[PDB]
Structure formats: structure tokens, C-alpha cells
């Protein structure tokens, strides 16, 4: 009923809107209301009221207040964060277990010549009368005691704990209730590119926030159809999908999203920087997209144009799916027809080309082609073949051969994605599983330390 949760700032926040409350790390507050990413709160110190970023604060009695506790992180994202540049041997984090509810997991950066950079996971068990342990000989009253113990010595661990995994201030939340925004709120600063049905620009919103704006050409979309689809796209909240912040519901329609500093995955892989990414990183890029596409599958949605051109890359090298569902709202009329085909033949499933049958299974086919794009660093699919040759070849059972530097398991995934019958193709859930655990035939999941 009432709101009795007291929170403390995990970072400083300077108000940029109207009803937002500014605060500094340590400042404690009372949550008066939970309105999503924004929470109405009261300063325990200066009595001031106002909205605060929910991701910048934590319950005062929580482990979320600790530098080494990572709340709401998956085993995979912990591995990716720990293996990120700027972390050292023994870098570590404690997180909520994904296998045993109420219990915790210790993730540590390790290095072996034969294995390379690795992340080892330890199960922190809870004691019934209070306390925690990884090995029965070593029990602790608190998790801080456990950390300090393993920071003094490995005591069975792969490495002595060094420093907490590095973290950065999270993204500031988009303004409360600013979905359909005025066009004058946006200053278009640099055109990033121009396509068949519109352009993309880097811009500033209300002088305070950098964003990307997809500007759709007049005649490309109905305002009402677009807004209905956009209201669904807004619900597709997942870390591997580009964040849609707002829209201008007047022709020319604008779609405002977070800015992704490294552009398209296609351009990145063809870049001097991306060409140097090792195969394990390429498989991780693939798994990131598979996680996003598994979410879209669980939500009964369809991308309709999956390809490296439609994957965006952050400065932190995180891949995020873009243009999910957009092809459904690009109308087929006299205006768009001049721009040429909406779908790239070499990425499109045969049933979609021949009958317009677009489903999650046609996305699976496209994901297979995207996997080949990634392992080939952006090479055109079906090298040496025109679009007409590809369609007739696919009808005769032709499939792209395994490229160099392509693990056979990855190629096998591609082949399954390219089954002619959509029902015989794998689920994104399966694809995500195989890719997330590609190098984990180690089994055990955790470490069995005595
Ligand atoms: C040769 N190159 C030249 C550069 N081209 C680039 C043109 C714009 C780039 N680009 C595009 C985007 C982008 C922006 C909005 C968008 O709209 C939707 C998002 C989700 C669901 C539905 C619609 C989709 C994509 C982008 C970005 N956010 N942040 C940073 N860069 C971004 C992506 C590639 C690509 C080809």
C-alpha cells in the first residue's frame, strides 16, 4: 500500500528535466511512487521531492550498494563485462544465481595459456541460520567477509580476487511521458546515412541528450499504422534490441533511438577495427543477436529484415538489433516502388520470396545468412552468384559452402537455419543455447572447488 522503501544514490544525478530531483552519491531518499525507469522520491536530507532515475539508486539494506554486486545480470553478460578491456586477472563480481534462487554466484576473471582469458563461476551457498560459503571449511557471516578472505588468498579459487569488475554510470532514462514528441525538440546535427525509404541522423533532444533519428520519406508509412506498430516495438525491452525512445507522428515520420557509436555491424566488420576481431568475439556477436531474436520469438514478434546492416554496435562492442518490425509498416505504393525492392533476396527465405510468408522461421533463415556474414567479415552472401542464380540454386538444394575460419558447429547451425521447410528450422531458443555455450563442453557449469 504505502511506500516505505529507503534508497541511497549509487551515482550522482543532475536534473535536466522539470520534475526531476538532483542528488549526489550517498544521498538517501524515500520512494513515494514507482513510475517505471523514473521514481518519485523525497530527499531525507533537504525534503525536496521529484523524480529520480530508478537505476541510479538501491535499497539501503541491499547488496546492490556494494561495488562488487551486479544486480540483474545474466551469467553471460557477467562473463562479457568481466572479459571487457580494463579488467585484470582476479577481477570479480557477485551476482544473483540464475540456477539456485536466493543463492549467489561469484564470477572471477582467470587466464590459462591453453584456455586464454576465461571467467570461472563459483556457487555461494546460503546457511539456514545465516551466513554464506563456497567451501564448507570456509564459512562467512557476510559476503564482504567472503570477498576480503578470497582477496587475501585464492583458498581453492582459480585466482586471488583482485578488484571489482569495472562499471560505468548507466544510461539516463528518457523523459517521463515523452513518446510522441514535437519535431522542434530535435536538432539534426549530422546525417549518418541515406537509404531507400529514409535517412538516419545524429541529433540532440532538447539540448540535453544525443540520439539517432531515422527520418522516413513522405509516402513511406501511414501515421496510424506506424504508431500502432511503434506502440508494440516500445514494449520489446531487451538489452540486445536498440532502445526506441520516441517518435514524431507526423510525415515525415521520425523514429528516435539511442545512439550507437560504432554504426552498423556490417560497416564495423568491414572496418580496420572490426577486421581484427578474433573468431570468439564474432561468435559472441552472434550469440548477442541470437539472444535478442530469442526475445522477439518469445514475444510472438517478427523482425522481417534480419541482416548485418540492421545490427548496430555500441562503443562497448555490444550488438543491438534494429529495424525490428519496420518492414511491415513500410507501405507498398507509388512512392516506395521507385526505391526498389524492400527485401534483400540473398537474406530472404524462399517461402517469403515466393508467397510473402514472413514468420519467425523466415527470420531463422535470415539469421543463418547473418552468421555467414559475421564469420566472413561482411562479405556478400553467395559470392560469385547473382540474385537470380541464388533463387534457382536454392531450389536445387544448393547451400553456401563452409568458409575458412568457420567452426563446423557454427556451419551446422547455418545449415539447420537454411532448411527449405520452415517447420524443420530451429527455434531461436535453441540457437541461443548452442551459441551461448559454444566453447563450454567443459560442463560442470560452475567450479567444483573442495
Ligand atoms: C555505408 N554505411 C554508411 C552508414 N550507414 C549507417 C547509417 C545509419 C546507422 N544507424 C542507424 C541507426 C538506426 C536508428 C533508428 C532506427 O529505427 C528503428 C529502430 C528499432 C526498431 C524500428 C526502427 C534504426 C537504426 C543508428 C543508431 N541508433 N545509432 C547509430 N547509428 C545508426 C547505421 C549504418 C550504413 C552504411
What the chain holds in terms of domains, given with CATH numbers, is 6-61 (2.30.30.40), 66-152 (3.30.505.10), 183-257 (3.30.200.20), 265-333+344-436 (1.10.510.10)
Q: Are 180 and 228 in contact (CB under 8 A)?
A: no
Closest CA to 322 of 262, 251, 250, 252: 262
Q: Which three cell numbers stand for residue 393?
A: 540454386
CA–CA separation, 323 and 314 (whole Å): 16
CA–CA separation, 211 and 171 (whole Å): 12
Exactly one of 27, 110, 284, 305 is catalytic; name it.
305
Task: Kindly give the pairing relationship between strand 28-35 and strand 244-248.
Answer: unpaired
PDB resolution in Å: 1.8
CA–CA separation, 149 and 132 (whole Å): 12
For the Cβ of 326 lying below 6 angstroms from any atom of ligand 1, the answer is yes
Q: Has 155 been annotated as catalytic?
A: no
Task: Kindly give the pairing relationship between strand 6-9 and strand 28-35.
Answer: antiparallel
Q: How far is the CA of 245 from the centre of ligand 1 (A)?
A: 14
Helices (H), 204-278: 223-235, 265-270
CA–CA separation, 372 and 108 (whole Å): 32
For the Cβ of 265 lying below 6 angstroms from any atom of ligand 1, the answer is no
Asked, as a colleague might, if the bond just before 328 is cis with ω within 30 of 0, I would say no
Beta strands in 269-384 (DSSP E): 311-313, 319-321
**In terms of C-beta density within 10 A (0-12 exposed, 13-18 middle, 19 or more buried), how is residue 346 classed?**
buried
Beta strands in 127-195 (DSSP E): 132-135, 138-140, 186-194
Backbone torsion region of residue 45, taken as left when φ is above 0, otherwise alpha when ψ lies between -120 and 50, otherwise beta: alpha
Residue owning the nearest CA to atom 25 of ligand 1: 322
CA–CA separation, 326 and 233 (whole Å): 9
CA–CA separation, 196 and 356 (whole Å): 20
Residue owning the nearest CA to atom 32 of ligand 1: 263
Which of 239, 257, 271 for a ligand 1 pocket mutation test, highest count of atoms within 8 Å of Cβ? 257
Question: How many CB atoms neighbour CB 13 within 10 A?
Answer: 20
For the Cβ of 212 lying below 6 angstroms from any atom of ligand 1, the answer is yes
CA–CA separation, 196 and 199 (whole Å): 8
Give SS3 for 97.
coil
Residue 326 Cα: closest atom of ligand 1: 22
- What Rg value do the Cα atoms of the chain yield, rounded? 24
Instruction: Tell me how long the chain is.
Output: 450
Which neighbouring-strand residues pair with 93? 107
Q: 326-330 long-range contacts, Cβ below 8 Å, gap at least 24? A: 326/229, 327/358, 328/229, 328/302, 328/304, 329/221, 329/222, 329/225, 329/226, 329/229, 330/197, 330/216, 330/220, 330/221
Q: How far is the CA of 374 from the centre of ligand 1 (A)?
A: 18
Residue 259 Cα: closest atom of ligand 1: 29
Provide the annotated binding site for ATP: 192-200, 214
Q: Which three cell numbers stand for residue 108?
A: 572471477
Q: How far is the CA of 430 from the centre of ligand 1 (A)?
A: 28
Which neighbouring-strand residues pair with 180? 247
Closest CA to 320 of 203, 189, 440, 212: 212
Residue owning the nearest CA to atom 10 of ligand 1: 263
Which neighbouring-strand residues pair with 331? none
CA–CA separation, 77 and 68 (whole Å): 15
Closest CA to 228 of 175, 180, 182: 180
Q: Are 220 and 331 in contact (CB under 8 A)?
A: yes
Helices (H), 303-386: 326-329, 334-337, 350-355, 360-375
Amino acid at each position: 500500500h504505502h511506500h516505505h522503501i529507503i534508497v541511497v544514490a549509487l551515482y550522482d544525478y543532475e536534473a535536466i528535466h522539470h520534475e526531476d530531483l538532483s542528488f549526489q552519491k550517498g544521498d538517501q531518499m524515500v520512494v513515494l511512487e514507482e513510475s517505471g525507469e523514473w521514481w518519485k522520491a523525497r530527499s531525507l536530507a533537504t525534503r525536496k521531492e521529484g523524480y529520480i532515475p530508478s537505476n541510479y539508486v538501491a535499497r539501503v539494506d541491499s547488496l546492490e550498494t556494494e561495488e562488487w554486486f551486479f544486480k540483474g545480470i545474466s551469467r553471460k553478460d557477467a562473463e562479457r563485462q568481466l572479459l571487457a578491456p580494463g579488467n585484470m586477472l582476479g577481477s570479480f563480481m557477485i551476482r544473483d544465481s540464475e540456477t539456485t534462487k536466493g543463492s549467489y554466484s561469484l564470477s572471477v576473471r582467470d587466464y590459462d595459456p591453453r584456455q586464454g582469458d576465461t571467467v570461472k563461476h563459483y556457487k555461494i551457498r546460503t546457511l539456514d541460520n545465516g551466513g554464506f560459503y563456497i567451501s564448507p571449511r570456509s564459512t562467512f557471516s557476510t559476503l564482504q567477509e567472503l570477498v576480503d578472505h578470497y582477496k587475501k588468498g585464492n583458498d581453492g579459487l582459480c585466482q586471488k580476487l583482485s578488484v571489482p569488475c569495472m562499471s560505468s554510470k548507466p544510461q539516463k532514462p528518457w523523459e517521463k511521458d515523452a513518446w510522441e514528441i514535437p519535431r522542434e525538440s530535435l536538432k539534426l546535427e549530422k546525417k549518418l546515412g541515406a537509404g531507400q525509404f529514409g535517412e538516419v541522423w545524429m541529433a540532440t533532444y532538447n539540448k540535453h541528450t544525443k540520439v539517432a533519428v531515422k527520418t522516413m520519406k513522405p509516402g513511406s508509412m501511414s501515421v496510424e499504422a506506424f504508431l500502432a506498430e511503434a506502440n508494440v516495438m516500445k514494449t520489446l525491452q531487451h538489452d540486445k534490441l536498440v532502445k526506441l525512445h520516441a517518435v514524431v507522428t507526423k510525415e515525415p515520420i521520425y523514429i528516435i533511438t539511442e545512439f550507437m557509436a560504432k554504426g552498423s555491424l556490417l560497416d564495423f566488420l568491414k572496418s580496420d577495427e572490426g577486421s581484427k576481431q578474433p573468431l570468439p568475439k564474432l561468435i559472441d556477436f552472434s550469440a548477442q543477436i541470437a539472444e535478442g531474436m530469442a526475445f522477439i520469438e518469445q514475444r510472438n514478434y517478427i523482425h522481417r529484415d534480419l541482416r548485418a546492416a540492421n545490427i548496430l554496435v555500441s562503443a562497448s562492442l555490444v550488438c543491438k538489433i534494429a529495424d525490428f518490425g519496420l518492414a511491415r509498416v513500410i507501405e507498398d505504393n507509388e512512392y516506395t516502388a521507385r526505391e526498389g525492392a524492400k527485401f534483400p533476396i540473398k537474406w530472404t527465405a524462399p517461402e517469403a520470396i515466393n508467397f510473402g510468408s514472413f514468420t519467425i522461421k523466415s527470420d531463422v533463415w535470415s539469421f543463418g545468412i547473418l552468421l555467414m556474414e559475421i564469420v566472413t567479415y561482411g562479405r556478400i552472401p553467395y559470392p560469385g552468384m547473382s540474385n537470380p542464380e541464388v533463387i534457382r540454386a536454392l531450389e536445387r538444394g544448393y547451400r553456401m559452402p563452409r568458409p575458412e575460419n568457420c567452426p563446423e558447429e557454427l556451419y551446422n547451425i547455418m545449415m539447420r537455419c537454411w532448411k527449405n521447410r520452415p517447420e524443420e528450422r530451429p527455434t531461436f531458443e535453441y540457437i541461443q543455447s548452442v551459441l551461448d555455450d559454444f566453447y563450454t563442453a567443459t560442463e560442470s557449469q560452475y567450479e567444483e572447488i573442495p
